[PDB]
């Protein structure tokens, strides 16, 4: 049974009211009184009950984070940013996994809003209108991170994926490649279908190259899918000379699946991954990837949320951080 501000007020012949003022460093408190109750608290080892405070102040200095799978090398990186900038601004966090399950996502949202979070950072592969509905119904700000929202209604922080895949695809053409394949993530998700797959087709038709509906493999972000993807693209009568994966993890599957088939990277084929995760530095040959400031994305987003929670004016709720490419040994 923790000690309340009443025990303190007792141990200092003062009223709960002044203890409260002393705990929040209220100016109008005679220095004699402040230090009297101050030391009093310490003598009692008084730790203020944040829930009780949360009821009265209607503010819990805690934001809720909804993420698909924190065990992921990508998301956990984003979680670090969100978490660092959060602590910076004295904000606690409630992290919950959704696994890209709509039911769970909207449920987590209800749950967090229920515990009175002062804000939310949302990450998901498929934001539907049903989401936007619930989002717009949130009493507290909501910021998206590394996610794609066709509706463009919720403030989000990320990078132009379509542009990114484009820059990559073109770069391969500038080096000669004519038959460039694409290994994507579940097409069910907009980020693959509407953003990455597009930036890929665009670079082609804009490079007069013919779209080959067989150079498009639909992996599932898994290392095995990317492993099973190269085994496929190397069967058709016409096989690619360069492959661009939507994520580094799939990339390794591609590198290896090929190495196991005899062909050696980059000699025979040229590979480019996406995200630039430590996975792309722990591979032989070192993987070239489309860079993405994963931590920055998480950190800029949480910083933006803080600006929205403090109710301070903000320009363009939809931010876009810059992206680049880092070629290594996986490309001649």
């Amino acid at each position: 049974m923790n000690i309340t501000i009443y025990d303190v007020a007792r141990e200092a012949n003062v009223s709960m009211a002044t203890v409260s003022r002393v705990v929040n460093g209220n100016p109008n408190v005679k220095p004699t009184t402040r230090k009297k109750v101050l030391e009093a608290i310490e003598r009692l080892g008084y730790r203020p009950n944040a829930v009780a405070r949360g009821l009265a102040s209607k503010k819990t200095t805690t934001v809720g984070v909804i993420i698909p799978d924190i065990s992921s090398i990508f998301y956990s990186e984003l979680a670090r940013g969100i978490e660092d900038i959060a602590t910076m601004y004295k904000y606690n966090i409630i992290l919950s996994n959704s696994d890209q399950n709509m039911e769970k996502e909207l449920h987590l949202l209800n749950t967090m809003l229920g515990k009175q979070v002062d804000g939310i950072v949302f990450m998901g592969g498929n934001i539907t209108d049903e989401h936007v509905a619930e989002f717009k119904r949130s009493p507290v700000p909501i910021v998206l991170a590394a996610s794609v929202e066709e509706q463009e209604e919720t403030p989000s922080v990320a990078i132009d994926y379509e542009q990114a895949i484009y820059d990559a695809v073109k770069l391969l053409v500038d080096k000669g490649h004519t038959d460039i394949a694409f290994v994507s993530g579940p097409m069910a998700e907009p980020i693959n279908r509407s953003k990455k797959l597009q930036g890929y087709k665009r670079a082609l038709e804009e490079a007069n190259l013919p779209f080959n509906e067989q150079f498009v493999a639909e992996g599932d972000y898994t290392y095995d899918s990317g492993l099973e993807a190269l085994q496929h693209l190397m069967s058709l009568d016409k096989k690619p000379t360069a492959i661009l994966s939507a994520t580094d993890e799939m990339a390794l599957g591609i590198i290896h699946a090929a190495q196991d088939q005899g062909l050696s990277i980059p000699e025979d084929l040229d590979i480019i991954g996406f995200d630039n995760t430590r996975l792309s530095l722990m591979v032989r040959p070192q993987l070239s990837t489309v860079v993405q400031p994963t931590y920055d994305i998480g950190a800029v987003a949480m910083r933006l949320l803080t600006k929205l929670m403090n109710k301070e004016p903000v320009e363009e709720h939809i931010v876009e951080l810059p992206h680049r490419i880092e070629l290594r040994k996986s490309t001649k």
Binding site: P293, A299, P322, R324
Partner: protein, 87 residues
């Protein structure tokens, strides 16, 4: 006061280090700034610093102008070399 560095960092001004540089510029009352490629942003603002996209190679320019614009610029240099983000 101001000093120019050349981003030696392999990842440039990003990730944690970036966050560290910003938290240091905030420990001082002075008005710390950071110009790069013809654009100056507050060095205490995570959004500005990380929006520039400073990569390995480029060179920045840390500003300052206040009752402690000195102890600050110095402190800024400390971190600028602690995580290895230019010099």
């Amino acid at each position: 006061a101001q000093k120019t560095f050349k981003v030696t960092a392999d990842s440039g001004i990003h990730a944690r280090p970036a966050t560290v540089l910003v938290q240091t510029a905030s420990k001082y009352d002075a008005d710390v700034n950071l110009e790069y490629n013809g654009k100056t942003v507050n060095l205490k603002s995570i959004m500005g610093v990380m929006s520039l996209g400073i990569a390995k190679g480029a060179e920045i320019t840390i500003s300052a102008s206040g009752a402690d614009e000195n102890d600050a610029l110095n402190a800024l240099e400390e971190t600028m070399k602690s995580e290895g983000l230019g010099e």
